[PDB]
């Protein structure tokens, strides 16, 4: 089975429409069908083998347009198809999937910082609002573990956050969890084994290379080995037991570097580089095209 790491959108000089896929097995990259509308600050996810691009904002030379769009990419056809749009535009959004349903979390609309959250049902092609977070969060990292949704860090409109919370579906309720050891907005958040990882981000002073993980059983946050490159607004995903971080901004350039974290050895390594440096991409894993 040839599953690839897909990266959609992003930013460099302006928001981008690129859709490219990386194959860890042979190190090759493929440029696929461009997004219908350029966008950065979006989030990506996969359901039923289909790739979804959610929210973001088109920061172009002529303006800034926050997106409420949900678009679907089918590897079998290499075509994008529009889906029902969200209730509100959500730039610097966080996304997570629970039992085939897409959760859109926080994000911004102009100067508005959302605490609202909504859930998408693919087969029915409908969005519905669920309980809002206890905190307004943009640049929020989201991940799912054991059918529970976690919203980590971000910016509430006034301060960057080290706080995090969890959503319990059966009770449509959010509960704060132990806060991170570091304030992080724009971090990459994913799940590996039984922990929620938060990598990189911005603490208000510098882009970060530190990485910490939350044990959902012990409720503690522990630092692991730091990435080689400090990065914020990075893309992140997990493939075959390892974490992959893609691009981001390090306060100097838009990174094209892609690092891989091996939990067994607690080490990061440079595995490849994107075709061009960029930040604010959406990332997910699914079957190769054709």
């Amino acid at each position: 089975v040839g599953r690839l790491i897909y990266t959609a959108g992003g930013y460099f000089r302006q928001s981008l429409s690129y859709l490219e896929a990386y194959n860890p097995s042979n190190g090759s990259w493929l440029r696929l069908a461009d997004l219908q509308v350029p966008r950065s600050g979006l989030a990506g996810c996969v359901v039923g083998g289909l790739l979804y691009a959610v929210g973001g904002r088109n920061n172009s030379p002529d303006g800034n347009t926050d997106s409420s769009a949900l678009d679907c990419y089918n590897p079998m056809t290499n075509q994008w198809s529009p889906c029902a749009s969200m209730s509100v535009p959500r730039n610097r959004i966080g996304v997570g999937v629970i039992d085939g349903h897409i959760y859109a979390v926080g994000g911004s609309h102009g100067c508005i910082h959302h605490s609202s959250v909504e859930r998408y049902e693919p087969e029915r092609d409908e969005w519905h609002l669920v309980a809002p977070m206890l905190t307004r969060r943009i640049g929020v990292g989201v991940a799912v573990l054991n059918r529970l949704l976690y919203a980590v860090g971000g910016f509430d409109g006034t301060n960057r956050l080290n706080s995090a919370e969890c959503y319990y579906p059966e009770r449509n309720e959010w509960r704060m969890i132990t806060p991170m050891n570091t304030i992080r907005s724009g971090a990459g958040v994913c799940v590996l084994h039984n922990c929620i990882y938060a990598a990189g981000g911005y603490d208000g002073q510098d882009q970060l290379n530190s990485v910490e993980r939350y044990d959902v059983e012990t409720e503690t946050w522990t630092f692991v080995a730091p990435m080689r490159h400090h990065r914020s607004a990075l893309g992140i995903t997990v493939h075959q037991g390892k974490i992959y971080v893609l691009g981001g901004y390090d306060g100097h350039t838009f990174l094209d570097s892609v690092e891989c974290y091996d939990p067994d050895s607690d080490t990061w390594s440079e595995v490849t580089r994107m075709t061009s440096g960029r930040s604010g991409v959406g990332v997910a894993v699914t079957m190769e095209p054709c």
């Binding site: 930013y11 800034n64 914020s232």
Partner: peptide, 9 residues
């Protein structure tokens, strides 16, 4: 420049 994203503005 947005220090978190690198984007202009």
């Amino acid at each position: 420049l947005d220090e978190e994203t690198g984007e202009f503005l």
